[PDB]
Amino acid sequence: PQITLWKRPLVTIKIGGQLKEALLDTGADDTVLEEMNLPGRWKPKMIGGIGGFIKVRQYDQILIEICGHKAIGTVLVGPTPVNIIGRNLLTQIGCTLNF
Amino acid sequence: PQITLWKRPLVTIKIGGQLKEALLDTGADDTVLEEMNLPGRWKPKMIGGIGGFIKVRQYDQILIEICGHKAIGTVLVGPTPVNIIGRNLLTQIGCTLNF
Numbered sequence: 001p002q003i004t005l006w007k008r009p010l011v012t013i014k015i016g017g018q019l020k021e022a023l024l025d026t027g028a029d030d031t032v033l034e035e036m037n038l039p040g041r042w043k044p045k046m047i048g049g050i051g052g053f054i055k056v057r058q059y060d061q062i063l064i065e066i067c068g069h070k071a072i073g074t075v076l077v078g079p080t081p082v083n084i085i086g087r088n089l090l091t092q093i094g095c096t097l098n099f
Numbered sequence: 100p101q102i103t104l105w106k107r108p109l110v111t112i113k114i115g116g117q118l119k120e121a122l123l124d125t126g127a128d129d130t131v132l133e134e135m136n137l138p139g140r141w142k143p144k145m146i147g148g149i150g151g152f153i154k155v156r157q158y159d160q161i162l163i164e165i166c167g168h169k170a171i172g173t174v175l176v177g178p179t180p181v182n183i184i185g186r187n188l189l190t191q192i193g194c195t196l197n198f
């Protein structure tokens with residue numbers, strides 16, 4: 001589809017057996033999701049933005065479905081105020097910017 | 100242009116007669132630039148990101164040219180980690196997400 005930017009580009013995603021709403025975020029290198037108890041091993045990480053850094057748990061090789069487009073990659077879990085789909089997964093679903 | 104997301108979507112902008120690099124950021128409601136001198140009146144504002152809130156200077160009706168496309172709108176100036184072009188201006192240059 002084509003998503004205009006009058007409002008926040010929110011879409012439904014499926015991860016770890018659950019449905020959620022997440023932002024398609026071209027400014028995000030990585031994908032950051034609200035706190036959730038995924039299984040498996042993880043590695044600590046810190047990611048920075050406006051306001052400073054937050055601590056997150058890096059899970060690798062996680063499947064996410066974004067508007068029916070499947071994508072598997074690294075997902076960070078932590079106290080983010082919003083679920084954020086970053087470029088690591090946006091590339092996998094063929095997402096481009098166009099003007 | 101059509102911009103893929105394997106690299107950061109960085110572009111050259113022209114504001115206050117000065118060229119800069121900025122990130123096309125569909126996850127930002129507003130446009131936030133690193134500290135710089137801009138003419139005209141401004142009002143203290145605050146914006147929240149991944150790591151909390153910062154203090155910024157709000158400039159309204161600022162002329163800014165993005166990858167050859169002109170926009171006139173609100174530009175926030177403050178301690179952001181990177182120059183970001185937010186949806187308030189992405190809409191003006193006709194930017195959409197597509198996949």
Ligand SMILES: CCOP(=O)(COc1ccc(C[C@H](NC(=O)O[C@H]2CO[C@H]3OCC[C@H]32)[C@H](O)CN(CC(CC)CC)S(=O)(=O)c2ccc3c(c2)OCO3)cc1)OCC
Nearest residue numbers: 027028030047048049050081126127128129147148149151
């Ligand atoms: C909504 C309820 O909470 P809230 O109101 C705001 O919550 C939000 C809403 C949107 C975002 C997304 C964020 N947007 C943003 O900062 O925009 C602000 C300016 O415009 C305003 O409009 C929205 C917020 C304001 C960027 O798109 C992406 N970011 C990087 C970018 C930072 C400049 C470039 C470096 S990143 O998230 O930090 C990040 C992600 C993965 C990474 C990484 C860094 O590093 C490696 O991987 C984050 C928090 O207040 C909370 C205190």
